[PDB]
Design a protein around this ligand. Structure first.
Ligand SMILES: O=S1(=O)CCN(Cc2ccco2)CC1
Ligand SMILES: O=S1(=O)CCN(Cc2ccco2)CC1
Length: 487
């Protein structure tokens, strides 16, 4: 790594300097490093130039605004200071070059939108790896090779992706946050494909506002290497964009494919939501088939179809995708289904808010021939407002509400339960059982073979905080033990 080579595309005849790491933070800027001084929302990195020089950085790249012209080479205490205009916009490209263009050395798929980003990202990584890739994820959960995700500037993005390349990753599914995109944090990444789970957003009822939102985004996307566009046609904005993008792949499970366009497409023709997942019949420009998904609810059908369409667009054979689809797993504690022969279906989900609980019950309902049970509580020593709302939701969208404990902490467990029950029309119809394990056992042991029991609130979070103790407890383990299966 050399300053001269680093800057060659932009600043010819830049000094020759060996560079260790690239950093925006003058605090950690050690000897031999390249310090990058950026002008930010409320901070100006150029302030910390003398400090960085004092810690022995090899060279500095600094925002040119007001202080210099673009590509201006200066020299302070023997250290090169190269000024570049619009450094924020160029930082991704700069870092990309520094870290040997990691997105050109694996298949990078970017997923954007509000809902289903995490799941779709995870399914992309899972499915690609089942097809022979060494897959990785980058996003809100964390970064890492599949099953070793460790819990973010344009430099960090490039740096982490290079780290994954070094660990042998050949495929990376990246969640792209709306904010990350706008702030040019993925500006120079070569995306093999970009998946749009949706492009809708609240607060856009004024026609001028929707117009500006779309223009802003369209402009942004025009400036990125998006690769193959895979768009959810069940989204209103998605459809309008698909109408303008003849090379984009349209995906639908609600009959929004327009075949007159002769574009590439994938649609679910029918779905059977059964006790252990969904059987998805689909047609596509690549051929038709049938997938046995072990994921629950309509949203996860959409998410799966988006991943399928993406991988098909990237040229993975339909037959191989079909042969591996049954091995796709739910994201841990996200509508994770547990079945056993002749037992009720039990779903463990992390849902701990009124909206999450409602969605999880609506999803569970689809797979439920009999009665839908909901076992849940609310956290103690936290905001109490959601309690009656979650009570009301459990009453409305389930057949049997089993109200129990969930991390009561120092608060009186029964008081929390009372707040939950307060929101119900017929609290008397609810079952109350304290001891969460006992409540789960009650639902599971009493529920019929064709019932579904949703156990909500914890998902993967395997502890019960009672008083000051994080006592060892797991919904997944409790459920697995009751059903005679392995969590
Ligand atoms: O830019 S982003 O939208 C996509 C990449 N992510 C993951 C990331 C990289 C380094 C630290 O965290 C940040 C948000
Ligand atoms: O589809 S996009 O995400 C990326 C490409 N851009 C510009 C464009 C349209 C047709 C040719 O170039 C639109 C947004």
């Amino acid at each position: 790594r050399n300053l001269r080579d680093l800057l060659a595309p932009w600043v010819p005849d830049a000094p020759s300097r060996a560079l260790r790491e690239m950093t925006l933070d003058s605090r950690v800027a050690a000897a031999g490093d390249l310090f990058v001084a950026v002008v930010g929302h409320q901070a100006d990195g150029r302030r910390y130039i003398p400090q960085a020089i004092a810690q022995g950085v090899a060279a500095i790249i600094a925002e040119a605004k007001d202080e210099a012209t673009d590509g201006e080479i200066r020299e302070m205490h023997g250290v090169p200071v190269i000024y570049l205009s619009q450094l924020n916009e160029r930082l991704s490209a700069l870092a990309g070059r520094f870290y040997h263009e990691p997105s050109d050395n694996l298949r990078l798929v970017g997923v954007t939108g509000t809902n289903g980003k995490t799941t779709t990202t995870q399914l992309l990584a899972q499915w690609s790896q089942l097809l022979g890739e060494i897959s990785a994820v980058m996003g809100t959960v964390g970064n890492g090779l599949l099953g070793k995700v460790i819990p973010g500037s344009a430099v960090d993005v490039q740096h982490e992706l290079a780290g994954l390349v070094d660990q042998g990753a050949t495929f990376c599914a990246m969640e792209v946050s709306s904010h990350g995109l706008v702030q040019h944090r993925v500006a120079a990444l070569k995306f093999a494909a970009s998946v749009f789970t949706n492009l809708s957003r609240d607060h856009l009822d004024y026609h001028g506002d929707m117009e500006h939102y779309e223009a802003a985004k369209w402009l942004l996307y025009s400036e990125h290497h998006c690769g193959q566009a895979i768009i959810n046609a069940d989204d209103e904005v998605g459809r309008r964009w698909l109408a303008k993008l003849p090379d984009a792949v349209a995906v639908s499970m609600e009959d929004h494919i327009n075949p007159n366009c002769h574009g590439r497409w994938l649609k679910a023709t029918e779905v059977n939501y059964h006790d252990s997942g969904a059987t998805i019949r689909f047609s596509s420009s690549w051929g038709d088939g049938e997938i046995e998904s072990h994921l629950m609810g309509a949203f996860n059908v959409s998410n799966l179809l988006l991943a399928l369409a993406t991988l098909l667009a990237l040229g993975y054979p339909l037959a191989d995708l079909l042969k591996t689809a049954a091995r796709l797993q739910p994201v841990c504690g996200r509508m994770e289904v547990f079945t056993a022969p002749g037992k009720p279906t039990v779903v463990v989900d992390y849902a701990h808010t009124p909206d999450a609980l409602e969605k999880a019950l609506q999803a569970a309902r689809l797979h439920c021939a009999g009665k839908l049970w909901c076992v849940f509580g609310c956290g103690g020593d936290r905001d109490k407002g959601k309690r009656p709302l979650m009570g009301a939701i459990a009453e409305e969208f389930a057949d049997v509400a089993v109200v129990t404990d969930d991390n009561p902490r120092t608060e009186e467990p029964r008081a929390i339960i009372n707040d939950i029950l307060a929101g119900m029309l017929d609290a008397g119809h609810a079952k109350v059982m304290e001891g969460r394990a006992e409540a789960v056992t009650c639902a599971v042991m009493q529920a019929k073979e064709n019932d579904v029991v949703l156990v909500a609130g914890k998902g993967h979070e395997d502890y019960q905080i009672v008083g000051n103790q994080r006592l060892d407890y797991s919904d997944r383990v409790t459920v697995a033990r009751l059903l005679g299966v392995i969590a």
